[PDB]
Design a protein around this nucleic acid. Structure first.
Ligand SMILES: [K+]
Ligand SMILES: [K+]
Ligand SMILES: [K+]
Ligand SMILES: [K+]
Ligand SMILES: [Mg+2]
Ligand SMILES: [Mg+2]
Ligand SMILES: [Mg+2]
Ligand SMILES: [Mg+2]
Ligand SMILES: [Mg+2]
Ligand SMILES: [Mg+2]
Ligand SMILES: [Zn+2]
Lengths: 92, 238, 94
RNA sequence: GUAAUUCGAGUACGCCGAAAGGGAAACAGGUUAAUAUUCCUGUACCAUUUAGCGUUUAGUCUGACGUCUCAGGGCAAGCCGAGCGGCGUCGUCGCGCCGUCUAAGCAGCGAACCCCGUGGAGAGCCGUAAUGGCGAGAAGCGGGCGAAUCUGUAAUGGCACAAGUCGGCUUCACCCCGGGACCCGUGAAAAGGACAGCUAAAUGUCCGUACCGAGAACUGACACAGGUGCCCCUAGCUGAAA
RNA sequence: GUGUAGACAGCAGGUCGCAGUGACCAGGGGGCUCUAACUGUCUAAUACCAACAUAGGAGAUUGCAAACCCGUAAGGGCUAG
RNA sequence: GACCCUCUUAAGGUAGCGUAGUACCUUGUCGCUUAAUUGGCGACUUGCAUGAAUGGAUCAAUGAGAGCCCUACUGU
């Protein structure tokens, strides 16, 4: 699994950031959204109940960044293309 | 009548020894809760308390009353403070100490139930729950004494915020002066041996010295109870 | 990145504002306290080193606005963390 | 309560307590021997009551705040060049000085901050005087909100009914706006105001107002070398500078 | 030369005086001791000090219906602790 | 003049400091400073009558504090 998260970005279409993640969930182009342990649920329960799956990361938004090549923090990480991956199966 | 002492002046109630009460934020006490009741409130602000030099939390309760609470360490804006006999034993909650497990740290402890909170209120202090009994519960005071309290006495769970306040040395008369401007205490203080004999039992003499032992009896009347009052012993421990 | 830390300058630290006053012991105490209080402090809500002292015992996170009551010169004390770890161990065990 | 009171702490209810805190609203010119934002001229504004025309958003905001430090914008004062009108100087020269004005009100624009919509920025980019900011959404691009002041109008008033027209520089010690740092110190309250008001008419009582405010109008017995007050203000040159 | 600017900094040459911060304004300096650490306070009107204060150090009382203190009492200060 | 005893009617001055702002004798002895110094500083110290928060010793910085010396300056 130490490469599966990394493989999802090495050979996969993803958009990091809550704004673009929410947009992808709204338009449906995202296969799912990957949310950190610190993300609220006032706008997130609606995206959960929808067909867009919501995955929970095992760590805060600060550390979800460095496991995906980003020096910054990521809270919402709706993927677009698994690519050379089957991360959707791991989500659900 | 060799003049009255500073303690007698303070008891008189003159302005030099009165607290600047208008400068203070609140009379900190637990919210009034009827028998077998509870109330919930949310923390809206953490404010500086001039009367204690420690933060206080402003709490809006469900009943429409806004109250200042003695802030425990870690209490944050947006926290939901619960007060009641059934309240979760969590930091910041006001629960009876009979429901607190042994070894938990409490503060703002009532002397009697519904008293508002008397003990463990200065910055950083805390009490530990030691034993539980059917009619009494024991806590270790910040002074080290064991206090047997009614288990229905309420206390907020945690320690008082502002720990380490006196770790920084004053370093300077002016800094302590600025602290003393918000208190009732007279600053600065003249040593009794520096006074004349009309002003203190220790005053007078061709050279500075008390002339009499500084340990005074517990029976000594006002104007005489000065120095080491009813001292069990004196000196640094051998 | 920091000041010109000269061959002799790394003793007074922030207590250099006092000059030759107040003795070495209390100047060292105040300098150590300043160094500990000015350090980055991680926010327990967002987990980034953005917690700064807003007042005597009041701490706020510059990012998420999380304000709380802590130590006078340190956002988190050891006794409070001991209380938290006791409650966390109890919660985990059950 | 007290032997008792005109005495006494506390409580409850009231009420007072600031001519340097808060605060509804007016300016310029003229007039007297002495008053003048008070009288007169001109042009405004505020409050209540009444009458008509319409009505809650309701409980929030404002009033409302410390010390230090700094950026930006403005501006009274100040300075420079040209024209114009006086005065001075004039042994030679052509310089020096003065003036060349203009209120409130009304209307218009709006810097910073803040907010909203797009945008998607990291083997890093964007900023600041400085601290900084950023996928928990940077830069860039649009919008909203929003200053001092400036522009016009008031423009006919005062000026030798003499000129009266222009530019530029700077700007404290004043106004607006924003940032930062410090506190074992945290820096008032309440009235009032804003958020739904427009038109008309009437009303706006009471007290103060002269003059000195000090090396002679106060106080120290004095026309007192003290004190109150250096309390708040102040032009050119030199000079860091009062 | 720096700077948008106000200005500021610097250079080369010539030159007068006894003297160029020319007036005005404007530290004399150093060494060895005593003493108090320091800023501060004080005998208004003979004592501005080594005295007082101070931060620092230590001790004492008291768990609050407390310790300490005011009042004849009612009731208070410390204590919105 | 150390060390056994005393006199011990509680104990008998530890570290330090020392002719001291404390030293009577006293202008103590010696050294530097001067032509010459009841002075200042240093050392010694038999401390009339020093000594540890009755705080001891010491001390950078500070001082309209108290002494002494050098230089400069001068109608002192
Ligand atoms: K007294
Ligand atoms: K004292
Ligand atoms: K007048
Ligand atoms: K000491
Ligand atoms: Mg006596
Ligand atoms: Mg009144
Ligand atoms: Mg002194
Ligand atoms: Mg003293
Ligand atoms: Mg001599
Ligand atoms: Mg001793
Ligand atoms: Zn945070």
């Amino acid at each position: 699994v130490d490469k599966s998260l990394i493989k999802a970005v090495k050979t996969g279409k993803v958009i990091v950031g809550a704004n673009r993640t929410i947009d992808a969930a709204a338009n449906g182009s995202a296969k799912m959204v990957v949310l950190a342990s610190n993300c609220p649920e006032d706008i997130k329960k609606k995206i959960q109940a929808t067909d867009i799956p919501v995955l929970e990361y095992e760590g805060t938004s600060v550390e979800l960044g460095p496991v995906c090549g980003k020096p910054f923090t990521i809270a919402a990480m709706a993927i677009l293309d698994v690519g050379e991956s089957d991360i959707l199966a791991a989500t659900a | 009548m060799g003049k009255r002492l500073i303690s007698q002046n303070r008891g008189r109630g003159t302005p030099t020894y009165r607290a600047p009460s208008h400068k203070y934020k609140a009379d900190l006490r637990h919210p009034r809760v009827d028998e077998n009741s509870s109330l919930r409130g949310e923390v809206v602000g953490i404010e500086h308390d001039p009367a204690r030099s420690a933060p206080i939390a402003k709490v809006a309760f469900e009943n429409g009353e806004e109250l200042f609470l003695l802030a425990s360490e870690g209490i944050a804006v947006g926290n939901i403070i619960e007060c009641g006999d059934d309240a979760e034993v969590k930091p910041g909650n006001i629960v009876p100490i009979g429901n607190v497990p042994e070894g938990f740290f409490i503060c703002n402890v009532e002397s009697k139930p519904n008293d508002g909170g008397k003990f463990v209120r200065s910055s950083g202090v805390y009490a530990t729950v030691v034993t539980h009994e059917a009619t009494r519960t024991a806590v270790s005071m910040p002074s080290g004494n064991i206090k047997w309290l009614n288990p229905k006495c309420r206390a907020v769970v945690g320690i008082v915020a502002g720990s380490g306040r006196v770790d920084r040395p004053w370093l300077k008369a002016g800094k302590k002066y600025h602290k003393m401007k918000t208190r009732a205490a007279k600053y600065p203080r003249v040593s009794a041996v520096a006074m004349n004999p009309r002003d203190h039992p220790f005053g007078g003499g061709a050279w500075k010295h008390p002339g009499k032992p500084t340990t005074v009896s517990r029976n000594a009347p006002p104007g005489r109870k000065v120095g080491l009052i009813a001292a069990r012993r004196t000196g640094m421990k051998r | 990145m920091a000041k010109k830390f000269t061959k002799k300058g790394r003793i007074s630290r922030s207590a250099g504002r006092f000059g030759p006053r107040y003795g070495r012991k209390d100047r060292k105490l105040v300098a150590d306290l300043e160094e500990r209080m000015r350090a980055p402090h991680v926010c327990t809500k967002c987990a980034r080193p953005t917690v700064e002292r807003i007042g005597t015992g009041i701490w706020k996170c510059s990012k998420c606005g999380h304000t709380f009551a802590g130590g006078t010169y340190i956002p988190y004390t050891s006794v409070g963390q001991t209380l938290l770890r006791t409650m966390k161990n109890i919660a985990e065990a059950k």
